[PDB]
Amino acid sequence: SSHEQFRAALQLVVDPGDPRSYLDNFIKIGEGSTGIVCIATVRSSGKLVAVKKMDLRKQQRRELLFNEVVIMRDYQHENVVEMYNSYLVGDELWVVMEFLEGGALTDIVTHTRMNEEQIAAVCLAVLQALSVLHAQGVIHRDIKSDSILLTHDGRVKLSDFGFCAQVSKEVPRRKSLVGTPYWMAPELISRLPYGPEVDIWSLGIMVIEMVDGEPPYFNEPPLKAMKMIRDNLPPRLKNLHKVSPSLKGFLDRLLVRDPAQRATAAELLKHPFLAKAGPPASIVPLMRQN
Ligand SMILES: Cn1cnc(Nc2nc(N3CCC(N)CC3)nc3ccc(Cl)cc23)c1
Numbered sequence: 624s625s626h627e628q629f630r631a632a633l634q635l636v637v638d639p640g641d642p643r644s645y646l647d648n649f650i651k652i653g654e655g656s657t658g659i660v661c662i663a664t665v666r667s668s669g670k671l672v673a674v675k676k677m678d679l680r681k682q683q684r685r686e687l688l689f690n691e692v693v694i695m696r697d698y699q700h701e702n703v704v705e706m707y708n709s710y711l712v713g714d715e716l717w718v719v720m721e722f723l724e725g726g727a728l729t730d731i732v733t734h735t736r737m738n739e740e741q742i743a744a745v746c747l748a749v750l751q752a753l754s755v756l757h758a759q760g761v762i763h764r765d766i767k768s769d770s771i772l773l774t775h776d777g778r779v780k781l782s783d784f785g786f787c788a789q790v791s792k793e794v795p796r797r798k799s800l801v802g803t804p805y806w807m808a809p810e811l812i813s814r815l816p817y818g819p820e821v822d823i824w825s826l827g828i829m830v831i832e833m834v835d836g837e838p839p840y841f842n843e844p845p846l847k848a849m850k851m852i853r854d855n856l857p858p859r860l861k862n863l864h865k866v867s868p869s870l871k872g873f874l875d876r877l878l879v880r881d882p883a884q885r886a887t888a889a890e891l892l893k894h895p896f897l898a899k900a901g902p903p904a905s906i907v908p909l910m911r912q913n
Pocket residue numbers: 652653654655660673675704720721722723724725726727769770772782
C-alpha cells in the first residue's frame with residue numbers, strides 16, 4: 624500500500640495535533656528496530672516523558688506500527704509502560720509515554736550479577752503482564768532484557784510492543800516469523816503455527832540472560848543459532864551451580880521444547896520460585912550505584 628494510505632490509517636488511531644507545540648529538550652537515548660527513543664520535557668508541567676519516533680518509510684512491515692499504539696492504549700497495567708498520547712508528525716509516528724529512568728534490564732545483566740530475589744522480581748512482573756496480555760489473546764513476540772524497563776525504586780515494566788500479534792477464537796494460531804533470533808521459540812523457528820507459548824519460551828531465555836549474562840548461542844551468527852535451537856536438545860546452563868533447584872525447576876517449566884507441555888503464564892504465577900520475589904526496593908542496589 625502507498626505511504627499516504629498508511630498515513631491516513633494512522634490519522635484515525637492517533638491523537639490530533641502536533642506534539643512539538645509542547646515538548647522541548649529532546650535527548651536521544653537509544654534505538655530500536657522500529658525507530659528511536661528520546662527524553663523530552665513537557666512545557667505545560669515540567670514533567671519528563673519518553674517519545675518513541677518511528678519513520679513510516681523506514682518500516683519493513685508498516686502494519687506493526689498500529690501495535691506501538693494499540694497495546695498500551697487498551698492494556699494499562701502496573702507492569703506495563705503507560706502511554707499518554709500518540710501523534711502523526713510529518714512521516715513519523717510519535718508515541719509519548721512515561722520516562723522509566725532506571726534504563727533497560729540489559730544494562731543490569733551485562734554489567735552486574737543478579738541474585739534470585741531480583742531474578743524472581745523481574746520474572747513475577749513479566750509474568751503478571753504476560754498473563755493479562757495472553758488472557759485477552761495478545762502475543763508480545765520480542766521478550767528479552769532489552770524490552771524490560773526499570774525505575775530507580777526497582778519497579779519493572781514490560782515495553783517494546785512493536786511486534787505484537789493478536790490471536791482469537793477465530794484464528795488461534797499464527798504463522799509469521801518475528802522476534803529476536805536467540806530468544807525465539809523452536810516452533811516459531813521451524814515456522815509452525817504458534818501461540819502465546821512463544822513468550823514463555825523467550826522469558827526462559829531471558830532467565831539465562833539474568834544467570835549467565837547472555838542468551839544461548841550468542842557467539843554464533845544469527846542463522847546458525849536459530850537452526851541450533853531447532854536441532855539441539857535445549858540449552859544447558861553455564862552457571863548451573865549458582866542456581867537453586869527452585870529456579871532450576873521454574874526454568875525447566877519455561878524451556879519445554881513442546882509448546883503443549885510448556886507452562887502458561889497463569890500457571891507460572893503460582894510457582895514457588897516466585898515466592899523468593901523481593902520487593903521493588905530489592906532492585907535498587909544494582910542500577911548505577913556500584
Ligand atoms: C519507552 N521508554 C520509557 N522509558 C524508557 N527509558 C529508557 N529506554 C531505553 N531503551 C531504548 C533502546 C533500547 N532498545 C531499549 C531501551 N534506554 C534507556 C537508557 C537510560 C535511561 Cl535512564 C532510560 C532508558 C524508554
